[PDB]
Design an enzyme around this catalytic site. Sequence first.
Site, PDB file in Angstrom:
ATOM      1  N   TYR A 107       4.218  -6.737  -0.995  1.00 53.20           N
ATOM      2  CA  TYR A 107       4.543  -6.752  -2.409  1.00 53.20           C
ATOM      3  C   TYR A 107       5.865  -6.030  -2.654  1.00 53.20           C
ATOM      4  CZ  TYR A 107       3.432  -7.479  -7.354  1.00 53.20           C
ATOM      5  OH  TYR A 107       3.386  -7.930  -8.653  1.00 53.20           O
ATOM      6  N   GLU A 121      -3.054 -14.624  -7.516  1.00 52.50           N
ATOM      7  CA  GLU A 121      -3.441 -13.227  -7.644  1.00 52.50           C
ATOM      8  C   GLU A 121      -4.430 -13.153  -8.803  1.00 52.50           C
ATOM      9  OE1 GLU A 121      -1.848 -11.382  -5.116  1.00 52.50           O
ATOM     10  OE2 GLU A 121      -3.221  -9.755  -5.654  1.00 52.50           O
ATOM     11  N   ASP A 181      -0.811  -1.627 -15.519  1.00 51.02           N
ATOM     12  CA  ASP A 181      -0.566  -2.833 -16.299  1.00 51.02           C
ATOM     13  C   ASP A 181       0.008  -2.495 -17.673  1.00 51.02           C
ATOM     14  OD1 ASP A 181      -1.376  -5.391 -14.828  1.00 51.02           O
ATOM     15  OD2 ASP A 181      -3.148  -4.090 -14.493  1.00 51.02           O
TER      16      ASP A 181
HETATM   17  O1  LIG Z   1       4.547 -10.567 -13.958  1.00 52.58           O
HETATM   18  P1  LIG Z   1       4.096  -9.155 -14.321  1.00 52.58           P
HETATM   19  O2  LIG Z   1       5.232  -8.322 -14.792  1.00 52.58           O
HETATM   20  O3  LIG Z   1       2.908  -9.152 -15.247  1.00 52.58           O
HETATM   21  O4  LIG Z   1       3.595  -8.502 -12.922  1.00 52.58           O
HETATM   22  C1  LIG Z   1       2.526  -9.154 -12.161  1.00 52.58           C
HETATM   23  C2  LIG Z   1       1.424  -8.166 -11.918  1.00 52.58           C
HETATM   24  N1  LIG Z   1       0.231  -8.740 -11.278  1.00 52.58           N
HETATM   25  S1  LIG Z   1      -0.118  -8.314  -9.757  1.00 52.58           S
HETATM   26  O5  LIG Z   1      -1.479  -8.682  -9.537  1.00 52.58           O
HETATM   27  O6  LIG Z   1       0.872  -8.898  -8.908  1.00 52.58           O
HETATM   28  C3  LIG Z   1       0.038  -6.560  -9.653  1.00 52.58           C
HETATM   29  C4  LIG Z   1       0.586  -5.988  -8.516  1.00 52.58           C
HETATM   30  C5  LIG Z   1       0.740  -4.617  -8.453  1.00 52.58           C
HETATM   31  C6  LIG Z   1       0.350  -3.833  -9.524  1.00 52.58           C
HETATM   32  O7  LIG Z   1       0.489  -2.424  -9.504  1.00 52.58           O
HETATM   33  C7  LIG Z   1       0.934  -1.775  -8.416  1.00 52.58           C
HETATM   34  F1  LIG Z   1       2.170  -2.062  -8.034  1.00 52.58           F
HETATM   35  F2  LIG Z   1       0.942  -0.494  -8.761  1.00 52.58           F
HETATM   36  F3  LIG Z   1       0.148  -1.925  -7.357  1.00 52.58           F
HETATM   37  C8  LIG Z   1      -0.195  -4.411 -10.662  1.00 52.58           C
HETATM   38  C9  LIG Z   1      -0.353  -5.776 -10.723  1.00 52.58           C
END
Ligand SMILES: O=P(O)(O)OCCNS(=O)(=O)c1ccc(OC(F)(F)F)cc1
EC number: 4.2.1.20
Lengths: 395, 395, 268, 268
Positions: free
Chosen positions: C175, C49, C60
């Site tokens: 997801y 990703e 984030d």
């Molecule tokens: O391991 P962490 O806690 O940093 O989480 C991983 C995040 N990376 S990601 O690209 O999957 C990702 C996936 C979804 C996100 O927001 C959403 F759900 F609103 F869409 C943000 C980042």
Amino acid sequence: TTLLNPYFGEFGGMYVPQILMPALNQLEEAFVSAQKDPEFQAQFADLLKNYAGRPTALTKCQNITAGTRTTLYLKREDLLHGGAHKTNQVLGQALLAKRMGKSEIIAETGAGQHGVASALASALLGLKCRIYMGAKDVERQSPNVFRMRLMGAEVIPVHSGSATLKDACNEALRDWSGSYETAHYMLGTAAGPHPYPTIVREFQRMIGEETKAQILDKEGRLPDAVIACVGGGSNAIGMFADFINDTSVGLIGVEPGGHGIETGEHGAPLKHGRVGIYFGMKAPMMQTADGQIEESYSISAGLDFPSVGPQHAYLNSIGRADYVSITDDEALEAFKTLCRHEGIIPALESSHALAHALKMMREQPEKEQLLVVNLAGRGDKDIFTVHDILKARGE
Amino acid sequence: TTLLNPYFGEFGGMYVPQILMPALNQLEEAFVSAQKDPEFQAQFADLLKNYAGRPTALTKCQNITAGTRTTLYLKREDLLHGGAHKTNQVLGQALLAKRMGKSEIIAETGAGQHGVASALASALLGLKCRIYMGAKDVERQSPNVFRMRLMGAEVIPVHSGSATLKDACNEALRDWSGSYETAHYMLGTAAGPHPYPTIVREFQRMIGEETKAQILDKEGRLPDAVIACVGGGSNAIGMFADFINDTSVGLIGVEPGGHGIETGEHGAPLKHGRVGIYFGMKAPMMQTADGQIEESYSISAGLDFPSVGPQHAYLNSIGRADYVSITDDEALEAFKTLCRHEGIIPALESSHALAHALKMMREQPEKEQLLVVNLAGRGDKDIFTVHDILKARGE
Amino acid sequence: MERYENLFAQLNDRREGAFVPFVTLGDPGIEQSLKIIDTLIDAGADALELGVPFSDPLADGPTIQNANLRAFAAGVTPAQCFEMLALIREKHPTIPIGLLMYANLVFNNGIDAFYARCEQVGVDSVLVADVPVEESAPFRQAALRHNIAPIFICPPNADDDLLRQVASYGRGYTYLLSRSGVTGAENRGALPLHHLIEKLKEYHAAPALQGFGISSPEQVSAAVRAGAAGAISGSAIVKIIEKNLASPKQMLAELRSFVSAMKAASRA
Amino acid sequence: MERYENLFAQLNDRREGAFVPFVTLGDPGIEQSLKIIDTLIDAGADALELGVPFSDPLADGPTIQNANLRAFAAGVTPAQCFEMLALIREKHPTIPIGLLMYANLVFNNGIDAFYARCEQVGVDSVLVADVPVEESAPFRQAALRHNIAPIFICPPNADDDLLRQVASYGRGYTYLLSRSGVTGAENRGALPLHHLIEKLKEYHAAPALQGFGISSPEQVSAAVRAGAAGAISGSAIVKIIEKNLASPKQMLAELRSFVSAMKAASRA
Ligand SMILES: O=P(O)(O)OCCNS(=O)(=O)c1ccc(OC(F)(F)F)cc1
Ligand SMILES: O=P(O)(O)OCCNS(=O)(=O)c1ccc(OC(F)(F)F)cc1
Ligand SMILES: *Cc1c(COP(=O)(O)O)cnc(C)c1O
Ligand SMILES: *Cc1c(COP(=O)(O)O)cnc(C)c1O
Ligand SMILES: [Cl-]
Ligand SMILES: [Cl-]
Ligand SMILES: [Cl-]
Ligand SMILES: [Cl-]
Ligand SMILES: [Cl-]
Ligand SMILES: [Cl-]
Ligand SMILES: [Cl-]
Ligand SMILES: [Cl-]
Ligand SMILES: [Cl-]
Ligand SMILES: [Cl-]
Ligand SMILES: [Cl-]
Ligand SMILES: [Cl-]
Ligand SMILES: [Cl-]
Ligand SMILES: [Cl-]
Ligand SMILES: [Cl-]
Ligand SMILES: [Cl-]
Ligand SMILES: [Cl-]
Ligand SMILES: [Cl-]
Ligand SMILES: [Cl-]
Ligand SMILES: [Cl-]
Ligand SMILES: [Cl-]
Ligand SMILES: [Cl-]
Ligand SMILES: [Cs+]
Ligand SMILES: [Cs+]
Ligand SMILES: [Cs+]
Ligand SMILES: [Cs+]
């Protein structure tokens, strides 16, 4: 699925992470319910009258229009408790929070006025208020930060991004993304994801409703135009809403021209930005060529929101409202004019609106016109800025 | 020879040089005439409503009285244009000047609020305003000085005597002694030579008249007491006047106790000074053993007038009104309380009044009492003073 | 899309979950980022990703906010990110590459052109963090037209209707959010997700990857045990970058160790 | 009082107006002030007007404001002023001494006791600058009880009733104000006063002395020619003090010259 249309034409929507959709849906439900609840309406009216001081005066300004065929009134939101119109909608949103069973408020602020409004509403109603503010704003706005702390709110500096308003806005939503069962996000302008543009409009619409009744009483007819300064759009849509169906009444919104449109240093995305998606909505915004969110620059610190409410972009598109800009220098001249000739110190934000009215008058002094300017705030907060400009100028 | 009694019992009079007697007589005549003139009254009412924002709210403060048998309302003069009650009487006096054919205004100011009120009234009504201010005050009150200059008034530092308010007062009268055919002296409190104590009372009495109507509407009966902070006495006599003949209503005036009565560092001549003759009247004053005029000290800069209005000394003498004091620290606690629990930032002056109400409540929490505090001003101007105290305190 | 199908089929045969790290492209520079990504892969990442630095990353937490900021401090732009993505795919034939986007970067120069560029460079999926299913239409249509999997979020509290929408519209993987809030290793998810995982399979959803707050091998194993096809880890990876900025050597070594351990945890 | 009667009778015989300087007692110190006053007398003053330093001298312009301030800087108090007055009278039998007071200093320890102290030290008159005829009753009564002339102001615009009041209640001399405004040499009076002077004589008023803005010999002669019994000069005298603070020698010399010239101008 929503109860209300999240869009004004092509503009608006609900561009928030999936996790926040139930929060928006809940808030929409609660609003729709409240708007039908005579008890909620009575509580709201009671706060507006006995706490905030509504109705606000409509002042006829004779000195500044002498010798022309302009008649100019100022709607005196500067007289509302807190010294700006923002107080109207924070009381409404604080009641909505209570309706939903929440005891906590999240707010963002840039120049500080929305934080102060959020803090005072929270103190009155016994809500635990936390307020996100860009670290650069915190440093620049010590007076407002202290006002918020005096009123028992927690002021949380935000260090991410550009450490200014847009970054505060992000932080508020990040918090809300985890806290929304107990906390209400008291968004500070008529923008953001649905239902906020609708809610903030309805909780500001008394500005225009009163203006309507007052001008009918004094003049026996509707105004030729109502004129308001446009940051995210709350004071303007508050003034406009009740006149939208009166098609003879011009609705004029004034965005900050800053150092001049041509310089790129301005805060007028509606007319000179580009449509994008940010802070939950599809709307004109200040942004780089490659889509990063940019600064909204004005001599007035309160015109820092880098976008504009979707209903404004809609009313522009269909030609119901017209949007113009006023530069830093024009706003300054208007500020000085009102102080000297009417004894009212206007917010620099509101000075933009006044400056445009004064231009309408001066450009065509024999044109018969009845204008209302929405004086959305008082200008005490601005006297140091103005002092420094006048001094540096040899004036 | 006068139309009206220049004395309230033993207090008051017209102790001005002979040259000024025709000025006082003229002003008295004009006032008496105006009070019978429906046109003058309509002009005055129009300014109060449409320019200053009257009527002012009466706010019920629930949080701060919870768990007691005190019901407390605040009369919100802090919401008046200019942010203090002083605006009411400057509009009236400016109209009186016009009635007499004068185009110029003289005013004195200490902390600046009366100068600002005088300037704004003058700017609205097209009068040429000059404002005397002790040089020490000018240096200390840059914000107010700039507000006055923005509104087109001339601010004249006074270097004589102690270079503070009493010295400004002298200078204003010296000017008036030569200029009174064309200039009106817009005295800033309910004190000085007759007819000013009478005039300033009548041009402030709407505070109490409205309070009366509002409390009858909300509570169905008169208040047990009305409470106001007492500098020279204008906001207090404004609140009291309409209740004087309601003998069940307590009239409580709060003078600044400063660092404590016993320290001599205070502003409470009514109860702790000595009667003398100064600034045109026989009244209690702050003065040395040998008769030189002294300082009136309070954490609140606006409580710098070294005497008190003669009607207050009279109402005290006959036992119709009761006068008390509140110390710097008590006022500070009241300021913090209102900010945190009601979201209203009060003037430190008005904080003295609030503190006494809070003491009435706390001392006897099971006593049923309906109180009004006159919140004569807003406290934005005070946030730096308070900040500095809290910081120096390790708070 | 099809890279995911092939991966999931193969992992099914290998009896393994997928381990999928997140990083911000160009953090802490383009060149170091390319080496970071190659290291993730070599150490056992099953897919990637990759975030395009954005001024307003409102889903984030601070770790990834700071990653966005470091890429910006190195002047990284979406154009440069797309050059990176082309090079990454040029080096690695089969690994699924998913982007983490925010809406304005997708809409900025036209949604259709965005997904066309993705197709050109060899991206497999796009997740737009601030587009809920209610707003997804032009995004998911553009994606499918250009052979890109649109990735949909299933919140831990998803109702039946939302499960059916995510199941129908999604491709590539679903997801599965661990919890509310924003990305961050400092907050572990505490809700059991096995009911969602079962309902997603019933509705023929794309295989689920659990993400948010995954920072330890036990959490990878837990996701697999609960029925998920694998797990995504972002903040914990990015923290290693942040920690090791002064030592590219130690940085890669620690990334290798961490990914190796996390991938090992995906063995059923 | 009677010192004035005798003076006015004698000047009548000498065919002369009275020249009467004002100074603030104790300006710029007690000792220098005593020498100043002796110099005024020796140089030809017919009578004196002496100010007790007061915190709020609201009928005085800047010159005399500053004189008040200099005496305060030297710590001068009303008690010390009264010691000075006793000593002045102890030295000079016949010269009329009038005080320029403000009300609070008279009322402070009792009005009656104030005038009793005046009588004790040998003062002849008291003018209370901020007491108009309307408020004068307890002041003029106390004065007469203690053989002190109460001095009343006749403004240039005085109406008939005011002329009759000032004529009836006054003793010693009648103060004929040159003009509106406050004390000061920088403003000369420009109104003709001969009608007032005639009406005051008709009503048997105490002889008139013109005061305010008199700073030159021509003005002394003019006052006499218009029918007044003499003239008072304050600011012009005090300016010489202010000018010469650094040189007591030059100060006295210039005071002597000025008073000599002004007194000479009083010859009919
Ligand atoms: O391991 P962490 O806690 O940093 O989480 C991983 C995040 N990376 S990601 O690209 O999957 C990702 C996936 C979804 C996100 O927001 C959403 F759900 F609103 F869409 C943000 C980042
Ligand atoms: O020569 P100038 O211009 O300084 O005037 C002389 C003043 N000295 S004085 O004591 O006679 C004197 C007399 C009257 C005064 O005020 C009053 F009229 F209101 F009573 C003040 C001073
Ligand atoms: C906050 C503010 C603005 C800008 O915000 P809007 O939402 O556009 O009203 C303008 N004027 C004043 C006085 C403000 O306080
Ligand atoms: C001016 C002022 C005072 C003191 O003056 P008063 O004449 O006694 O009213 C007190 N409170 C406020 C808010 C003031 O502005
Ligand atoms: Cl619409
Ligand atoms: Cl749409
Ligand atoms: Cl309803
Ligand atoms: Cl709380
Ligand atoms: Cl605080
Ligand atoms: Cl009409
Ligand atoms: Cl546009
Ligand atoms: Cl026309
Ligand atoms: Cl009375
Ligand atoms: Cl009396
Ligand atoms: Cl009437
Ligand atoms: Cl003018
Ligand atoms: Cl100015
Ligand atoms: Cl009732
Ligand atoms: Cl007393
Ligand atoms: Cl009781
Ligand atoms: Cl792109
Ligand atoms: Cl859809
Ligand atoms: Cl599917
Ligand atoms: Cl004495
Ligand atoms: Cl009398
Ligand atoms: Cl006589
Ligand atoms: Cs006009
Ligand atoms: Cs805008
Ligand atoms: Cs109560
Ligand atoms: Cs007082």
